[PDB]
Amino acid sequence: AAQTNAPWGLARISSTSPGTSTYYYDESAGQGSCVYVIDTGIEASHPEFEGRAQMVKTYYYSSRDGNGHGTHCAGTVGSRTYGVAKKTQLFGVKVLDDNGSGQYSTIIAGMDFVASDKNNRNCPKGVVASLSLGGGYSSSVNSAAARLQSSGVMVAVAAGNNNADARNYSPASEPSVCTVGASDRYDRRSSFSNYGSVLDIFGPGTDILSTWIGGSTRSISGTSMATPHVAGLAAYLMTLGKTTAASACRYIADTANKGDLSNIPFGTVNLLAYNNYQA
C-alpha cells in the first residue's frame, strides 16, 4: 500500500533515501497487534484513531489527555494518516499529568500494569509499549522497563533530549529495551537527541506531524516523536510474523538503514529504522 503526501517520517521509514513523501507498507498494517502508549493519555475520540484507541488506566483524576503529548505519540504509532501501524489497537496508560510530569513510582506502576494488563487484551500478533518519557538514572525505573520487556512486550523508550549520553537517563539506559534516538528529514542526528552506546536505533524525531488534542494536529520535535515510529514499526513487523516482542529491537537494528545519518558520535550506532517493504 502507498500513502501519498505522508509525513516525512513515515516516508523515511519505508525508504532507502531521504527526500521522498510517500509511505509504503503492507496492508496488514499492524492488525492484530496492540501498542500501549504510556504517557499523558490519548484523546481516543480523535477521528484519526477510528475507534482503535482507548484509555485503559490513569493515575490521576482523569484519563483524558489534557496535554497533547500522549495523543501526538499515539498518532505516530497508529493513527490513520500520521501512524506507522494504521490498524493496530492503541491502549493509553496515563502516567504523566497534564503538565507532562510524573513521579517515577507512578511510571513504574504503569509499566507493571502493562505487563499484566496485556493478559486482558486480544493481541494475537504481539504487544508493544511506547515510552516517550524519562528522567535521571534510576535502577528501579530500568528494572521496571526490563520486567515489562521480559514479560513479552516490545519496549521502545526515548533516548532523551539533552544532547548527552543516554547512559545517565532512565529508562533510556536499560540495556534490554529498545532505546530510540531522533533524526531529521535530511538524515542528521536531531540537535537535541541523546546518543551513546545504549542507543539501539534512530527514528524520525524533528518536525513530526501527528494528532493533537481538540481533534487537531501539529508538528513537534523530540525523541518522544522518534520512539513511537519504532514502536509502530515493531507492531507492524510482528503482525507480518517477521519478528517477536523479544527479538524485534534486534531485528529492527539488523534491517535498518546503516551508515546514512550525519553527526552520529563515535561509538553510537548509525542505524535508521526501516520497514524493508517491497511493494
Report how far residue 78's alpha carbon sits from residue 91's, in angstroms, rounded to the nearest whole number.
Answer: 11
Say whether 207 counts as a known binding-site residue.
no
Say whether 187 counts as a known binding-site residue.
no
Report how far residue 224's alpha carbon sits from residue 120's, in angstroms, rounded to the nearest whole number.
Answer: 27
Q: Using an 8 Å Cβ cutoff, are 233 and 273 in contact?
A: yes
C-alpha distances (whole Å) from 242 to each of 120, 122, 201 are 24, 19, 18
Give φ, ψ of 36 to 5 degrees.
Answer: -90, 130
Report how far residue 171's alpha carbon sits from residue 184's, in angstroms, rounded to the nearest whole number.
Answer: 23
Task: Please report whether residue 35 resides in a domain.
Answer: yes
Task: Please report whether residue 140 resides in a domain.
Answer: yes
Task: Please report whether residue 84 resides in a domain.
Answer: yes
Domain hosting 254: range is 2-272
Q: Please, what sign has the CA dihedral across residues 242, 126, 268, 161?
A: positive
Model resolution, angstroms: 1.2
What's the structural domain count of the chain? Answer: 1
Task: Please report whether residue 278 resides in a domain.
Answer: no
Q: How many CB atoms lie within 10 A of CB 157?
A: 34
Q: Using an 8 Å Cβ cutoff, are 131 and 157 in contact?
A: yes
CATH code, domain with 194: 3.40.50.200
Report how far residue 243's alpha carbon sits from residue 232's, in angstroms, rounded to the nearest whole number.
Answer: 13
DSSP string, the chain: -EETT--HHHHHHT-SSSS---EE--TTTTTTEEEEEEES---TTSGGGTT-EEEEEESSS--S-SSSHHHHHHHHHH-TTT-SSTT-EEEEEE-S-TTS---HHHHHHHHHHHHHHGGGS--TTEEEEEE---EE--HHHHHHHHHHHHTTEEEEEE--SSSSBGGGEETTT-TTSEEEEEE-TTSBBPTT--BSTT--EEEE-SSEEEEETTTEEEEE-SHHHHHHHHHHHHHHHHHTTS--TTTHHHHHHHTSEES--BSPPTTS--EE-------
Say whether 184 counts as a known binding-site residue.
no
Report how far residue 39's alpha carbon sits from residue 60's, in angstroms, rounded to the nearest whole number.
Answer: 12
Q: In DSSP terms, which residues pair with 53 in a beta bridge?
A: 90
Experiment type: X-ray
Here the cell at position 113 is 500494569
Report how far residue 157's alpha carbon sits from residue 133's, in angstroms, rounded to the nearest whole number.
Answer: 7
Active site residues: 39, 69, 224
Say whether 175 counts as a known binding-site residue.
yes
Q: 537517563: which residue's cell?
A: 169
C-alpha distances (whole Å) from 11 to each of 79, 108, 131, 166, 254 are 15, 34, 23, 27, 20
Task: Please report whether residue 277 resides in a domain.
Answer: no
Q: How crowded is the C-beta side of 260, counted as CA atoms within 13 Å?
A: 22
Report how far residue 8's alpha carbon sits from residue 22's, in angstroms, rounded to the nearest whole number.
Answer: 8
Task: Please report whether residue 155 resides in a domain.
Answer: yes
Say whether 200 counts as a known binding-site residue.
yes
Task: Please report whether residue 148 resides in a domain.
Answer: yes
Our CA angle for 103, 106, 112, nearest 5°, is 145
Report how far residue 250's alpha carbon sits from residue 170's, in angstroms, rounded to the nearest whole number.
Answer: 20
Which residues contact residue 263 at a Cβ distance below 8 angstroms, ignoring those fewer than 6 apart?
A: 188, 189
Our CA angle for 228, 229, 235, nearest 5°, is 85
β-strand pairing of 216-220 with 201-204 = unpaired
Task: Please report whether residue 279 resides in a domain.
Answer: no
